[PDB]
From a paper:
To gain insight into the evolution of choanoflagellate STING and define the molecular determinants of 2′3′-cGAMP selectivity, we purified SmSTING fused to a stabilizing T4 lysozyme domain and determined a 2.7 Å crystal structure of the protein in complex with 2′3′-cGAMP. The structure of choanoflagellate STING reveals a surprising combination of features previously thought to be unique to bacterial or metazoan STING proteins. The SmSTING cyclic dinucleotide-binding domain forms a canonical V-shaped, homodimeric architecture that is conserved in all STING proteins across the tree of life. At the base of the homodimeric interface, SmSTING helix α1 forms a hydrophobic stem known to be required for dimerization of human and metazoan STING proteins. However, the SmSTING stem sequence ASAQSIW is distinct from the canonical GLAWSYY motif in human and metazoan STING proteins and exhibits increased hydrophilic character more similar to bacterial STING stem helices. The SmSTING structure also reveals an additional beta strand turn β1–β2 previously observed in some bacterial STING proteins that extends the canonical β-strand lid region responsible for sealing the ligand-binding pocket. In both SmSTING and bacterial Larkinella arboricola STING (LrSTING), the additional β-strand turn extension forms two pairs of hydrogen bonds with residues on the underlying canonical lid. In the SmSTING ligand binding pocket, residues S160, T262, and T266 form a hydrogen-bonding network with 2′3′-cGAMP that is remarkably similar to interactions in the binding pocket of human STING. However, the conserved arginine residue R264 instead makes nucleobase-specific contacts to the guanosine base in 2′3′-cGAMP, mirroring the nucleobase-specific interactions observed in bacterial STING.
Here, we define a complete cGLR-STING signaling axis in choanoflagellates that reveals a remarkable blend of evolutionary features derived from both bacterial- and metazoan-like immune proteins. Biochemical analyses demonstrate that choanoflagellate cGLRs specifically synthesize the nucleotide immune signal 2′3′-cGAMP and that the associated choanoflagellate STING proteins exhibit correspondingly selective recognition of 2′3′-cGAMP as an activating signal. Choanoflagellate STING proteins have a predicted architecture similar to human STING with four N-terminal transmembrane helices fused to a C-terminal cyclic dinucleotide-binding domain. Mutagenesis analysis of the SmSTING cyclic dinucleotide-binding pocket confirmed the critical role of R264 and other conserved residues in controlling 2′3′-cGAMP recognition. Together, these structural and biochemical analyses demonstrate that choanoflagellate STING proteins share an overall architecture conserved with animal STING proteins and reveal how retention of bacterial STING-like features contributes to selective ligand recognition.
Author numbering:
A (entry chain B): -16 to 35, 37 to 144, 149 to 183, 185 to 200, 202 to 203, 207 to 276, 282 to 360
B (entry chain A): -16 to 145, 150 to 359
Write the structure that this text describes.
Amino acid sequence: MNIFEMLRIDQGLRLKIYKDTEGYYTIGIGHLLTKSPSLNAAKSELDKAIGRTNGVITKDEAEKLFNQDVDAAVRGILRNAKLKPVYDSLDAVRRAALINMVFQMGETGVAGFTNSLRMLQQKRWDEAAVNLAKSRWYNQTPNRAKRVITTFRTGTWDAYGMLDVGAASAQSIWSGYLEIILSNGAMDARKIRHQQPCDCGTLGHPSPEFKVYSIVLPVLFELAPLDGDVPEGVATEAELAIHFPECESLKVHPELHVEPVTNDRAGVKGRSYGQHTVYSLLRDARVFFPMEWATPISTVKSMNLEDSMLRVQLKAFCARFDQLVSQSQNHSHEIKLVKGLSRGDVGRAIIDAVREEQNRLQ
Amino acid sequence: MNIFEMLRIDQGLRLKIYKDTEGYYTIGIGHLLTKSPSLNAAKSELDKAIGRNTNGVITKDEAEKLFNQDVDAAVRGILRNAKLKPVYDSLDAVRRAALINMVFQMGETGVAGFTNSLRMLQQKRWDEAAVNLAKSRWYNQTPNRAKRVITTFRTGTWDAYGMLDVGAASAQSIWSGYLEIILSNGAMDARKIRHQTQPCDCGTLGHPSPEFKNVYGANSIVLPVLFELAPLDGDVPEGVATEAELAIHFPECESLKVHPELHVEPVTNDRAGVKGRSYGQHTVYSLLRSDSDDDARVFFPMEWATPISTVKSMNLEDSMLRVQLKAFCARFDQLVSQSQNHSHEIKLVKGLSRGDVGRAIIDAVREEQNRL
Ligand SMILES: Nc1nc(=O)c2ncn([C@@H]3O[C@@H]4COP(=O)(O)O[C@H]5[C@@H](O)[C@H](n6cnc7c(N)ncnc76)O[C@@H]5COP(=O)(O)O[C@@H]3[C@@H]4O)c2[nH]1
């Protein structure tokens, strides 16, 4: 990964205007806008900052805004006599770890770590990591401090997972659900149903009678917002924009669904698995596909984890989910995980995801 | 907890006679019966220990009676040992169990080898001793058990034997993702009983209709409680039990019967972009009603807690799975108990093994009859 992923995990990312801890309007990864109590005043600074917003900005814009902050923070480091020698000595990864401290505490704050910085400069990682864990910075935010400290000691991104909650949930959804339905048959073999009776065909080849409504995609889209912002329930067309931001032509078809897979498990006869609602996008001909949200994400959110820990586990969830997908045999391109930093980012990620699945078939 | 749960996690517990690493017949928590290769000799030796006709199958309270007999004998040998008596006497109750844990694993002569580590414990240098113990071969050979025993020495608490544990995530999984969803429709007693091939005015769990009592008995009673079975070793049966296979699924659950034709109505809900996902259609089980010694029965809905089966598929080390599943029951009971309107609608049946669950089910169902 990179320094951007590091701070999104440790600090978080917001693509809507929010009030920070002291109440001042901020965007992206902790980018201060104004000390004015006028929501419009901050928006005016935001509009000129990107040159476009209505208070909402995109992912690659927030990463463009982040790099502007990164260079300015590095600029101040070179202007600070206590932080210049250590930065010059550090390697690429450990430079990001020091930059994280400046983003959290300010250049004046990081300069206070006189003893800890000298141990880093003399490449005494174990010695420095023990001293950093004794500070007030560690006591205030130990989850973030542990990962930044672990980054200094080892120089790797390893802190950012066999017994992780996120990887266990990715293991939970694959073995306890997706593997069951995939064992039944192929995705193109899965029958399409109307809530009417229709011989509506299958996902791979929709029947000519179905073509009332065009192509249908035999791909299960599993949506994973990396901030855990999953909408509850299923959206009606009125609420569709609330559930799925920035999906231009998206529509929801409650009356159509993919047939569920019946299983016997844990003392339950005919447990229903993998019943999907069919959604469409503009291809006025449209593209129908079955998609659903990654349901462990909603449950892990209910555990009330610390915000950075929730982002850490969801990051492990997607990392292992893709790995299990890569090792999948005889089920090539049937499961696609749509990853987004926020719920809105998923909406834009859905559009390209469906386009790339069309191109492989067409 | 206590020393019994500590060793039950670290070593495991068996209620059937088994051969240990060296081939000797054993019961409970590493309790040697005989060095004879004759299974009958071991069964007779077990009978003399318990004062019963066991045939090799033992209960929890019997295995804990045998465990404390090993504990006292192990403490006695320690007090007879000049290298271990000063350190044992200085330690507190919890840290004493940790020292007893090492004796159970490697023997008094083995534990006596830790000359440097034991002296740090005697003069209360916890952090220093925990670092020195982690340098031994005992740590490299058995790292999961050594880590928990070392943490017990360092902190003097049972915290190592079960905040974001894998077991608690699965316990949150079943509560937030299933049980809470089903209960959001209404109370458990309001849930209707359904027949497979017919329409039956069968009533609800809280109020069984007169037609239901016509088919299954005029003294039949139905409990509006969902019994969630939790085997603490992860032994969950595959699939659903048939009438013939009932004994395999539920060992030593006396008079148990299964009614495939009866089921609790499923709850349809909207989740994760799914319209009307079907939830909680349960199989109805019955037991003979000890209330009135008759043929009248007690009907209840029962199923296994399937995250236990899911957690097993992650291929954890035996002791690590026991730690996580114990955390699962701790978080599952905590979530159920703290509910403000669903406290006695869900009852979690905990057992040390699958056989232990079979006897635990009866106690659970009898306990619900008296409450209602
Ligand atoms: N999109 C989707 N469609 C499904 O049909 C489905 N079924 C399961 N899952 C998810 O895969 C994983 C399988 O784990 P498990 O079954 O052990 O725990 C489940 C199980 O203990 C219980 N549960 C939920 N739904 C059912 C059900 N229909 N039958 C029996 N038990 C259920 O509650 C737990 C959490 O369910 P979800 O939190 O919604 O997510 C599960 C889970 O993350 C599904 N995901």
